[PDB]
Amino acid sequence: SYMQQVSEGLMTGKVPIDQVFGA
Amino acid sequence: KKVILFDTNHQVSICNQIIDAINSGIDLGDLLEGGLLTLCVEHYYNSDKDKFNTSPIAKYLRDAGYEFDVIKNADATRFLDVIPNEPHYSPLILALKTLESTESQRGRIGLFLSFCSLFLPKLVVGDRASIEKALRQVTVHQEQGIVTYPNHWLTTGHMKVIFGILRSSFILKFVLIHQGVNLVTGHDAYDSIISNSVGQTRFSGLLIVKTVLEFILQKTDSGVTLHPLVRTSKVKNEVASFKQALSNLARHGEYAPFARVLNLSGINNLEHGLYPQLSAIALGVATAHGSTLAGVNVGEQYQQLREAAHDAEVKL
């Protein structure tokens, strides 16, 4: 899909986990 | 952890003999990875140690505690000439003089490394799976006409040997993966074979967790956020542990998709079995879209949340 990019970016560290999980 | 590099003016012949010993099933012991690293260094840096030591690979390996101890010889034409007199290398030596010298050919090193690379996609699964996968890949590339492996490399015994060498060796896996990823797109068939293998290796051992994560996510133009069911009080611990494991994985950066294969630290708990409720939610949401999560079976205890996750996604 596209969000798949989100999970992968969370996993490679390209997306801060705090953006999605917080605190 | 001291890695011995072998330095001579007959590098190609020495390398091909290292490949000889490896393929013979001979256990090189604590010189194994050293030997392997030499191969890699001969291949990618043409045995230029100064060019290697400034490379990202050497950078990372040194950053991971590996120390390089070069053995300069020259005049040495034979791997046997190069092994320290030290007596704990006596049986090794005893086996190595039973070695036939396949006269060094061109590309055999690249041949070897690409062959090794074919075992990566399913390495973490086991020997049977890695080897079956390797064989199917072998026929794929064979019929492409891009490369032909020797048939005696295709016996189960030899491929079990190679599987073992990959298992035991961190450096081999790391070099093949790093080069698979970072090496451009030139005109070397072996680099493209390795590249293809590494491409098929992405998220090996971590695809279930990845897709579960994907399906407990929620797209909102206010950013992107976790599913509401994920934020209940019964699932306050799973989310905690999952976030922590995910952070540990994230530490490894661009090597994160290969972290299970390279056996990187911090991955203990990145295993969907530990997260039944999130798996239920993810499978629910998945079902509501038609597709499903491969390898995820929800036990009775969380079937309710499963439908709780299911219906609510269809009403959206």
Side-chain angles (χ1 to χ4, degrees), chain A:
Chain A
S1 304
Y2 231 85
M3 208 132 103
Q4 209 174 349
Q5 296 292 69
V6 183
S7 66
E8 152 151 17
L10 287 169
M11 279 170 141
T12 65
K14 281 185 164 191
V15 178
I17 274 165
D18 293 67
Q19 262 183 61
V20 184
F21 293 66

PDB file of all heavy atoms in Angstrom, chain A:
ATOM      1  N   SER A   1       0.824  -1.202   0.000  1.00  0.00           N
ATOM      2  CA  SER A   1       0.000   0.000   0.000  1.00  0.00           C
ATOM      3  C   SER A   1       0.862   1.258   0.000  1.00  0.00           C
ATOM      4  O   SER A   1       1.709   1.448  -0.874  1.00  0.00           O
ATOM      5  CB  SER A   1      -0.930   0.008   1.215  1.00  0.00           C
ATOM      6  OG  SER A   1      -1.724  -1.166   1.258  1.00  0.00           O
ATOM      7  N   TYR A   2       0.622   2.121   0.981  1.00  0.00           N
ATOM      8  CA  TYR A   2       1.374   3.359   1.128  1.00  0.00           C
ATOM      9  C   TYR A   2       1.815   3.518   2.576  1.00  0.00           C
ATOM     10  O   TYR A   2       2.964   3.861   2.853  1.00  0.00           O
ATOM     11  CB  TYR A   2       0.525   4.558   0.700  1.00  0.00           C
ATOM     12  CG  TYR A   2       1.208   5.469  -0.294  1.00  0.00           C
ATOM     13  CD1 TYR A   2       1.172   5.195  -1.655  1.00  0.00           C
ATOM     14  CD2 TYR A   2       1.890   6.602   0.128  1.00  0.00           C
ATOM     15  CE1 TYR A   2       1.795   6.024  -2.567  1.00  0.00           C
ATOM     16  CE2 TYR A   2       2.516   7.438  -0.778  1.00  0.00           C
ATOM     17  CZ  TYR A   2       2.466   7.144  -2.124  1.00  0.00           C
ATOM     18  OH  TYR A   2       3.089   7.973  -3.029  1.00  0.00           O
ATOM     19  N   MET A   3       0.894   3.256   3.498  1.00  0.00           N
ATOM     20  CA  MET A   3       1.205   3.295   4.919  1.00  0.00           C
ATOM     21  C   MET A   3       2.343   2.326   5.210  1.00  0.00           C
ATOM     22  O   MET A   3       3.158   2.555   6.103  1.00  0.00           O
ATOM     23  CB  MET A   3      -0.025   2.931   5.751  1.00  0.00           C
ATOM     24  CG  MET A   3      -0.050   3.564   7.132  1.00  0.00           C
ATOM     25  SD  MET A   3      -1.631   4.345   7.512  1.00  0.00           S
ATOM     26  CE  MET A   3      -2.360   3.123   8.600  1.00  0.00           C
ATOM     27  N   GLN A   4       2.393   1.242   4.442  1.00  0.00           N
ATOM     28  CA  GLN A   4       3.461   0.265   4.567  1.00  0.00           C
ATOM     29  C   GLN A   4       4.775   1.018   4.756  1.00  0.00           C
ATOM     30  O   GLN A   4       5.671   0.588   5.494  1.00  0.00           O
ATOM     31  CB  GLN A   4       3.497  -0.593   3.303  1.00  0.00           C
ATOM     32  CG  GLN A   4       4.009  -2.005   3.446  1.00  0.00           C
ATOM     33  CD  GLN A   4       3.856  -2.773   2.145  1.00  0.00           C
ATOM     34  OE1 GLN A   4       3.191  -2.309   1.216  1.00  0.00           O
ATOM     35  NE2 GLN A   4       4.461  -3.952   2.074  1.00  0.00           N
ATOM     36  N   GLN A   5       4.854   2.165   4.084  1.00  0.00           N
ATOM     37  CA  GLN A   5       5.963   3.101   4.211  1.00  0.00           C
ATOM     38  C   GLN A   5       6.095   3.587   5.642  1.00  0.00           C
ATOM     39  O   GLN A   5       7.198   3.846   6.117  1.00  0.00           O
ATOM     40  CB  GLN A   5       5.778   4.292   3.265  1.00  0.00           C
ATOM     41  CG  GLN A   5       5.798   3.933   1.787  1.00  0.00           C
ATOM     42  CD  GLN A   5       7.164   3.474   1.306  1.00  0.00           C
ATOM     43  OE1 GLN A   5       7.643   2.403   1.674  1.00  0.00           O
ATOM     44  NE2 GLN A   5       7.805   4.296   0.484  1.00  0.00           N
ATOM     45  N   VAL A   6       4.962   3.732   6.322  1.00  0.00           N
ATOM     46  CA  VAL A   6       4.965   4.204   7.696  1.00  0.00           C
ATOM     47  C   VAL A   6       5.569   3.141   8.608  1.00  0.00           C
ATOM     48  O   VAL A   6       6.505   3.429   9.341  1.00  0.00           O
ATOM     49  CB  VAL A   6       3.556   4.562   8.193  1.00  0.00           C
ATOM     50  CG1 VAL A   6       3.631   5.121   9.600  1.00  0.00           C
ATOM     51  CG2 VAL A   6       2.926   5.583   7.273  1.00  0.00           C
ATOM     52  N   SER A   7       5.019   1.930   8.590  1.00  0.00           N
ATOM     53  CA  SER A   7       5.582   0.825   9.365  1.00  0.00           C
ATOM     54  C   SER A   7       7.079   0.628   9.097  1.00  0.00           C
ATOM     55  O   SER A   7       7.877   0.499  10.032  1.00  0.00           O
ATOM     56  CB  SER A   7       4.822  -0.474   9.079  1.00  0.00           C
ATOM     57  OG  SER A   7       5.008  -0.906   7.743  1.00  0.00           O
ATOM     58  N   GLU A   8       7.464   0.622   7.823  1.00  0.00           N
ATOM     59  CA  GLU A   8       8.871   0.448   7.474  1.00  0.00           C
ATOM     60  C   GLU A   8       9.747   1.603   7.970  1.00  0.00           C
ATOM     61  O   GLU A   8      10.867   1.386   8.437  1.00  0.00           O
ATOM     62  CB  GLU A   8       9.034   0.285   5.963  1.00  0.00           C
ATOM     63  CG  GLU A   8      10.378   0.764   5.443  1.00  0.00           C
ATOM     64  CD  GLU A   8      10.818   0.024   4.200  1.00  0.00           C
ATOM     65  OE1 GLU A   8       9.961  -0.625   3.558  1.00  0.00           O
ATOM     66  OE2 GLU A   8      12.024   0.083   3.875  1.00  0.00           O
ATOM     67  N   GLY A   9       9.224   2.823   7.893  1.00  0.00           N
ATOM     68  CA  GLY A   9       9.963   4.002   8.311  1.00  0.00           C
ATOM     69  C   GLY A   9      10.100   4.066   9.819  1.00  0.00           C
ATOM     70  O   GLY A   9      11.087   4.574  10.347  1.00  0.00           O
ATOM     71  N   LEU A  10       9.084   3.562  10.507  1.00  0.00           N
ATOM     72  CA  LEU A  10       9.126   3.378  11.945  1.00  0.00           C
ATOM     73  C   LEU A  10      10.196   2.362  12.292  1.00  0.00           C
ATOM     74  O   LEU A  10      10.899   2.495  13.294  1.00  0.00           O
ATOM     75  CB  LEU A  10       7.769   2.906  12.469  1.00  0.00           C
ATOM     76  CG  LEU A  10       6.634   3.928  12.506  1.00  0.00           C
ATOM     77  CD1 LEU A  10       5.311   3.235  12.779  1.00  0.00           C
ATOM     78  CD2 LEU A  10       6.913   4.986  13.556  1.00  0.00           C
ATOM     79  N   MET A  11      10.314   1.344  11.448  1.00  0.00           N
ATOM     80  CA  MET A  11      11.248   0.255  11.702  1.00  0.00           C
ATOM     81  C   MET A  11      12.692   0.602  11.357  1.00  0.00           C
ATOM     82  O   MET A  11      13.616   0.101  11.996  1.00  0.00           O
ATOM     83  CB  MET A  11      10.814  -0.994  10.941  1.00  0.00           C
ATOM     84  CG  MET A  11       9.718  -1.755  11.658  1.00  0.00           C
ATOM     85  SD  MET A  11       8.991  -3.073  10.680  1.00  0.00           S
ATOM     86  CE  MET A  11       8.792  -4.319  11.943  1.00  0.00           C
ATOM     87  N   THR A  12      12.890   1.461  10.363  1.00  0.00           N
ATOM     88  CA  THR A  12      14.241   1.858   9.987  1.00  0.00           C
ATOM     89  C   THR A  12      14.653   3.132  10.715  1.00  0.00           C
ATOM     90  O   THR A  12      15.798   3.568  10.625  1.00  0.00           O
ATOM     91  CB  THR A  12      14.367   2.086   8.471  1.00  0.00           C
ATOM     92  OG1 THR A  12      13.559   3.204   8.082  1.00  0.00           O
ATOM     93  CG2 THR A  12      13.929   0.848   7.706  1.00  0.00           C
ATOM     94  N   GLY A  13      13.713   3.719  11.450  1.00  0.00           N
ATOM     95  CA  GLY A  13      13.999   4.893  12.252  1.00  0.00           C
ATOM     96  C   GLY A  13      13.844   6.199  11.499  1.00  0.00           C
ATOM     97  O   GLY A  13      14.167   7.264  12.022  1.00  0.00           O
ATOM     98  N   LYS A  14      13.350   6.127  10.267  1.00  0.00           N
ATOM     99  CA  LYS A  14      13.129   7.333   9.478  1.00  0.00           C
ATOM    100  C   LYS A  14      11.934   8.113  10.005  1.00  0.00           C
ATOM    101  O   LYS A  14      11.849   9.328   9.829  1.00  0.00           O
ATOM    102  CB  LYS A  14      12.920   6.993   8.002  1.00  0.00           C
ATOM    103  CG  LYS A  14      14.197   6.692   7.243  1.00  0.00           C
ATOM    104  CD  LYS A  14      13.903   6.485   5.770  1.00  0.00           C
ATOM    105  CE  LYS A  14      15.168   6.573   4.934  1.00  0.00           C
ATOM    106  NZ  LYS A  14      14.855   6.639   3.479  1.00  0.00           N
ATOM    107  N   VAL A  15      11.011   7.407  10.648  1.00  0.00           N
ATOM    108  CA  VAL A  15       9.902   8.043  11.345  1.00  0.00           C
ATOM    109  C   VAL A  15      10.052   7.858  12.849  1.00  0.00           C
ATOM    110  O   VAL A  15      10.040   6.728  13.339  1.00  0.00           O
ATOM    111  CB  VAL A  15       8.542   7.475  10.894  1.00  0.00           C
ATOM    112  CG1 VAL A  15       7.409   8.126  11.667  1.00  0.00           C
ATOM    113  CG2 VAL A  15       8.359   7.664   9.398  1.00  0.00           C
ATOM    114  N   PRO A  16      10.204   8.970  13.585  1.00  0.00           N
ATOM    115  CA  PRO A  16      10.195   8.938  15.050  1.00  0.00           C
ATOM    116  C   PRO A  16       8.977   8.198  15.589  1.00  0.00           C
ATOM    117  O   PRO A  16       7.856   8.449  15.148  1.00  0.00           O
ATOM    118  CB  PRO A  16      10.146  10.416  15.427  1.00  0.00           C
ATOM    119  CG  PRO A  16      10.855  11.098  14.316  1.00  0.00           C
ATOM    120  CD  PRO A  16      10.584  10.294  13.066  1.00  0.00           C
ATOM    121  N   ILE A  17       9.210   7.294  16.533  1.00  0.00           N
ATOM    122  CA  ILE A  17       8.150   6.468  17.094  1.00  0.00           C
ATOM    123  C   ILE A  17       7.167   7.326  17.891  1.00  0.00           C
ATOM    124  O   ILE A  17       5.990   6.992  18.017  1.00  0.00           O
ATOM    125  CB  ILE A  17       8.760   5.336  17.967  1.00  0.00           C
ATOM    126  CG1 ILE A  17       9.115   4.135  17.088  1.00  0.00           C
ATOM    127  CG2 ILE A  17       7.814   4.899  19.071  1.00  0.00           C
ATOM    128  CD1 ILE A  17      10.017   3.138  17.758  1.00  0.00           C
ATOM    129  N   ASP A  18       7.648   8.471  18.364  1.00  0.00           N
ATOM    130  CA  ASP A  18       6.833   9.387  19.151  1.00  0.00           C
ATOM    131  C   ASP A  18       5.756  10.072  18.308  1.00  0.00           C
ATOM    132  O   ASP A  18       4.710  10.450  18.827  1.00  0.00           O
ATOM    133  CB  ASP A  18       7.711  10.441  19.813  1.00  0.00           C
ATOM    134  CG  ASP A  18       8.637   9.856  20.863  1.00  0.00           C
ATOM    135  OD1 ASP A  18       9.538   9.087  20.481  1.00  0.00           O
ATOM    136  OD2 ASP A  18       8.455  10.156  22.066  1.00  0.00           O
ATOM    137  N   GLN A  19       6.010  10.223  17.011  1.00  0.00           N
ATOM    138  CA  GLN A  19       4.995  10.726  16.088  1.00  0.00           C
ATOM    139  C   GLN A  19       3.726   9.888  16.104  1.00  0.00           C
ATOM    140  O   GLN A  19       2.625  10.410  15.960  1.00  0.00           O
ATOM    141  CB  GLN A  19       5.538  10.775  14.662  1.00  0.00           C
ATOM    142  CG  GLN A  19       6.042  12.127  14.220  1.00  0.00           C
ATOM    143  CD  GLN A  19       6.501  12.115  12.777  1.00  0.00           C
ATOM    144  OE1 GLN A  19       5.714  11.849  11.867  1.00  0.00           O
ATOM    145  NE2 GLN A  19       7.778  12.412  12.557  1.00  0.00           N
ATOM    146  N   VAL A  20       3.896   8.580  16.247  1.00  0.00           N
ATOM    147  CA  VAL A  20       2.788   7.644  16.119  1.00  0.00           C
ATOM    148  C   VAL A  20       2.308   7.151  17.484  1.00  0.00           C
ATOM    149  O   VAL A  20       1.114   6.948  17.701  1.00  0.00           O
ATOM    150  CB  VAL A  20       3.187   6.445  15.240  1.00  0.00           C
ATOM    151  CG1 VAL A  20       2.003   5.519  15.023  1.00  0.00           C
ATOM    152  CG2 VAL A  20       3.723   6.936  13.905  1.00  0.00           C
ATOM    153  N   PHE A  21       3.248   6.965  18.405  1.00  0.00           N
ATOM    154  CA  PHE A  21       2.925   6.485  19.745  1.00  0.00           C
ATOM    155  C   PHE A  21       2.807   7.628  20.751  1.00  0.00           C
ATOM    156  O   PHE A  21       1.857   7.674  21.535  1.00  0.00           O
ATOM    157  CB  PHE A  21       3.977   5.476  20.222  1.00  0.00           C
ATOM    158  CG  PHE A  21       3.979   4.184  19.445  1.00  0.00           C
ATOM    159  CD1 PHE A  21       4.344   4.155  18.107  1.00  0.00           C
ATOM    160  CD2 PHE A  21       3.621   2.997  20.058  1.00  0.00           C
ATOM    161  CE1 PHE A  21       4.341   2.969  17.395  1.00  0.00           C
ATOM    162  CE2 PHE A  21       3.619   1.807  19.352  1.00  0.00           C
ATOM    163  CZ  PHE A  21       3.981   1.794  18.018  1.00  0.00           C
ATOM    164  N   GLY A  22       3.766   8.551  20.724  1.00  0.00           N
ATOM    165  CA  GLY A  22       3.769   9.677  21.641  1.00  0.00           C
ATOM    166  C   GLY A  22       4.415   9.375  22.982  1.00  0.00           C
ATOM    167  O   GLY A  22       4.596   8.209  23.340  1.00  0.00           O
ATOM    168  N   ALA A  23       4.733  10.444  23.717  1.00  0.00           N
ATOM    169  CA  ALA A  23       5.368  10.405  25.043  1.00  0.00           C
ATOM    170  C   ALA A  23       6.208   9.159  25.326  1.00  0.00           C
ATOM    171  O   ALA A  23       7.413   9.143  25.074  1.00  0.00           O
ATOM    172  CB  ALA A  23       4.300  10.556  26.125  1.00  0.00           C
TER     173      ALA A  23
END
